[PDB]
Design an enzyme around this catalytic site. Structure first.
Site, PDB file in Angstrom:
ATOM      1  N   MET A 220       0.864  -1.175   0.000  1.00 54.02           N
ATOM      2  CA  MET A 220       0.000   0.000   0.000  1.00 54.02           C
ATOM      3  C   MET A 220       0.907   1.234   0.000  1.00 54.02           C
ATOM      4  SD  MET A 220      -3.543  -0.875   1.825  1.00 54.02           S
ATOM      5  CE  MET A 220      -3.207  -0.524   3.536  1.00 54.02           C
TER       6      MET A 220
ATOM      7  N   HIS B 258       9.299   0.938   3.177  1.00 57.48           N
ATOM      8  CA  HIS B 258      10.421   1.007   4.098  1.00 57.48           C
ATOM      9  C   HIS B 258      11.207  -0.307   3.992  1.00 57.48           C
ATOM     10  CE1 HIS B 258       8.082  -1.664   6.628  1.00 57.48           C
ATOM     11  NE2 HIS B 258       7.119  -0.766   6.744  1.00 57.48           N
TER      12      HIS B 258
ATOM     13  N   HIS C 189       9.408  -3.598   3.492  1.00 56.57           N
ATOM     14  CA  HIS C 189       8.929  -3.883   2.137  1.00 56.57           C
ATOM     15  C   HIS C 189      10.094  -4.340   1.270  1.00 56.57           C
ATOM     16  CE1 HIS C 189       6.038  -0.784   3.565  1.00 56.57           C
ATOM     17  NE2 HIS C 189       5.154  -1.525   2.921  1.00 56.57           N
TER      18      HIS C 189
ATOM     19  N   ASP D  92       9.195   8.739  -3.164  1.00 57.17           N
ATOM     20  CA  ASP D  92      10.222   7.954  -2.515  1.00 57.17           C
ATOM     21  C   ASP D  92      10.014   6.485  -2.906  1.00 57.17           C
ATOM     22  OD1 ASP D  92      11.267  10.203  -1.023  1.00 57.17           O
ATOM     23  OD2 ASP D  92       9.507  10.020   0.280  1.00 57.17           O
ATOM     24  N   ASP D  93       8.757   6.054  -2.985  1.00 61.29           N
ATOM     25  CA  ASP D  93       8.475   4.659  -3.332  1.00 61.29           C
ATOM     26  C   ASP D  93       9.112   4.212  -4.643  1.00 61.29           C
ATOM     27  OD1 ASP D  93       7.019   4.643  -1.034  1.00 61.29           O
ATOM     28  OD2 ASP D  93       5.040   4.555  -2.005  1.00 61.29           O
TER      29      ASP D  93
ATOM     30  N   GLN E 209      12.944   4.049  -4.551  1.00 64.73           N
ATOM     31  CA  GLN E 209      13.450   2.872  -3.861  1.00 64.73           C
ATOM     32  C   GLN E 209      13.308   1.629  -4.738  1.00 64.73           C
ATOM     33  OE1 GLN E 209      12.923   2.579   0.468  1.00 64.73           O
ATOM     34  NE2 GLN E 209      11.193   4.005   0.267  1.00 64.73           N
TER      35      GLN E 209
ATOM     36  N   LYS F 123       5.174 -10.211   9.595  1.00 65.24           N
ATOM     37  CA  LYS F 123       4.729  -9.216  10.565  1.00 65.24           C
ATOM     38  C   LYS F 123       3.203  -9.209  10.713  1.00 65.24           C
ATOM     39  CE  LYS F 123       4.111  -4.828   9.877  1.00 65.24           C
ATOM     40  NZ  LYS F 123       4.439  -3.467   9.376  1.00 65.24           N
TER      41      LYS F 123
ATOM     42  N   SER G 120       7.318  -0.679  10.587  1.00 62.94           N
ATOM     43  CA  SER G 120       5.940  -0.493  10.180  1.00 62.94           C
ATOM     44  C   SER G 120       5.775   0.977   9.834  1.00 62.94           C
ATOM     45  CB  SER G 120       5.031  -0.861  11.363  1.00 62.94           C
ATOM     46  OG  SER G 120       3.670  -0.915  10.980  1.00 62.94           O
ATOM     47  N   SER G 121       4.957   1.277   8.834  1.00 60.64           N
ATOM     48  CA  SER G 121       4.763   2.666   8.468  1.00 60.64           C
ATOM     49  C   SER G 121       4.096   3.427   9.593  1.00 60.64           C
ATOM     50  CB  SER G 121       3.944   2.779   7.184  1.00 60.64           C
ATOM     51  OG  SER G 121       4.798   2.576   6.074  1.00 60.64           O
ATOM     52  N   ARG G 122       3.329   2.727  10.425  1.00 60.94           N
ATOM     53  CA  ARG G 122       2.670   3.401  11.548  1.00 60.94           C
ATOM     54  C   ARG G 122       3.658   3.842  12.643  1.00 60.94           C
ATOM     55  NH1 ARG G 122      -0.779  -1.738  13.285  1.00 60.94           N
ATOM     56  NH2 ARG G 122      -0.773  -1.828  10.988  1.00 60.94           N
TER      57      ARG G 122
END
Ligand code: APC
Ligand code: APC
Ligand code: MG
Ligand code: MG
Lengths: 289, 284
Positions: A38, A42, A45, A86-87, A90, A158, A194-196
């Protein structure tokens, strides 16, 4: 039909375009790998991407789609982090050849019409607070799998319950794809990436190490049995400032209608302020290794 | 090692993995896999689907025979004639019959399933609210096992056909759905295994469904109301025909447009036997 430049990142937004390209590639002998995400990529991923990359002669397709269907009412959807630029950078740096970035309209032209109904597992653990969350996940993953038709699809350990449900989806609908679970990537102190995590302030970030510390303590205490394992994890969580535990459960590896017998998974979900964190770890009862 | 496949002969496989491997192998050899899903007890109606599949150049026809428990209302009574069915397929030149057991199709019971859109609760979904979830779930599985280029269904079960088209579009399935015209008895009655249950008076009265539909199709030059009233009059002229519904919808089964193409569907009970039929309608 569309153009595919090997060795370069090719971005397609139309389902039909990536479908045609995947098919063409598959016909030439290259094995298609799919890494559903989604966005807001990071290191966690990237581990999935790298796992896909190492499969001999494979072409990696990474989908980036913030799936509205797996979000419950609220500003959760609007609040989800988005960092497209950024996605893709990377992905390019990882040598990924295909990025699939569909629009909501292309994925849901008819709204929610035919959907996937998960089994009972979807109502538990993470499904408790969000009864419709996993139906959203399985519906979009089924679609992604039909669009891309990959030989293997990659998911992180995860989100263990999600991984188990995808295995159920693949088995239950006879999907011809191998589901590959990838080990959780962690920060230096153990915190599952985690993005959170970006929502944890300095204090919360410090206290959050308690989840992974609790799990690993439990994994080693497990030589003394399940009670010892759970009590060790609880003690660590209970000593953590500002950590409110949602659940801490020890289950069989399939998380299903099976009692814990020897091997299992210990899962935890806790709130630090408004940020709900998850983590899980493999557990062996009565085993010193 | 790919399972054995004898060209020109009827090859029967019960294991999902076996037909899956054979289908994949054949597709690579330049054959186009055609799938005709059935529940056995084959009659001329099923044969029309088979012949439709056979005529596609390079076709290798896969006929599945599986009494799907999930589409039966809250099973044992269903007719089963394995040998005769297989004989008809062999006579049609069908090269693959897929005959799985319930355990092989549902090794984990009903776990992950397909949830149809709201059309599944209307018309036939009234009396059988879970029927179409069962149909779409088993059809999705068959499509994933066989991976056919085209799949065939009869227009007689129009709502079923429409929902499968919805399944395919919604899940981005790469298969063409082909609807095959309803095969009918000499007097118009849609062929169905359940017709044998009708006694003489019921069988005579049953012609009213098809006669009502064809009358409506021709009355349609006068408008939608004229078409509907004509069909109702025909059904009203028959004894012992309890109409459950008679509805004119657009071709995707949404509301009927002011004018244009549509579909008229009817369902009725004659004694303990429920019959259905439908027909293309052009308004104006
Ligand atoms: N630290 C980690 N290690 C391994 N896999 C991870 C991971 N973090 C995420 N993943 C995997 O990457 C895939 C995509 O994850 P996403 O659903 O995009 C959100 P996320 O990265 O998990 O963060 P978020 O829910 O906190 O926003 C999933 O299969 C997930 O399990
Ligand atoms: N008269 C007919 N003409 C064309 N296709 C037909 C047909 N009768 C059945 N079919 C098609 O054959 C396939 C198998 O459906 P079945 O229900 O198994 C047979 P059936 O004759 O409809 O039995 P039934 O009387 O128990 O409902 C479906 O695609 C169905 O629409
Ligand atoms: Mg996540
Ligand atoms: Mg029928």
């Amino acid at each position: 039909i569309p153009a595919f430049h090997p060795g370069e990142l090719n971005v397609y937004s139309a389902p039909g375009d990536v479908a045609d390209v995947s098919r063409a590639l598959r016909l030439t002998g290259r094995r298609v790998m799919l890494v559903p995400t989604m966005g807001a990529l990071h290191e966690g991923h990237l581990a999935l991407v790298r796992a896909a990359k190492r499969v001999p002669g494979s072409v990696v397709v990474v989908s980036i789609f913030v799936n509205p269907m797996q979000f419950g009412a609220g500003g959760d959807l609007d609040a989800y982090p988005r960092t497209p630029d950024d996605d893709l950078a990377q992905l390019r740096a990882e040598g990924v050849e295909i990025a699939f970035t569909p629009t909501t309209a292309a994925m849901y032209p008819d709204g929610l019409r035919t959907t996937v109904q998960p089994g009972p597992l979807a109502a538990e653990l993470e499904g408790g607070p969000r009864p419709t969350h996993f139906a959203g996940v399985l519906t979009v993953v089924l679609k992604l799998l039909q669009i891309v038709r990959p030989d293997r699809v990659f998911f992180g350990e995860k989100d263990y319950q999600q991984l188990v449900l995808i295995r159920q989806l693949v088995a239950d609908f006879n999907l011809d794809v191998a589901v590959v679970g990838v080990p959780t990537v962690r920060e230096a102190d153990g915190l599952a990436m985690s993005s959170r995590n970006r929502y944890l302030d300095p204090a919360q970030r410090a206290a959050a190490v308690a989840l992974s510390a609790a799990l690993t303590a439990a994994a080693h205490a497990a030589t003394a049995g399940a009670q010892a394992a759970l009590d060790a994890a609880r003690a660590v969580l209970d000593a953590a400032p500002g950590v409110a535990v949602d659940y801490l459960e020890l289950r069989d590896i399939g998380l299903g209608p099976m009692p814990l017998n020897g091997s299992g998974r210990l899962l935890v979900a806790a709130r630090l302020g408004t940020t709900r964190l998850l983590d899980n770890i493999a557990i062996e009862i009565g085993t010193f290794a």
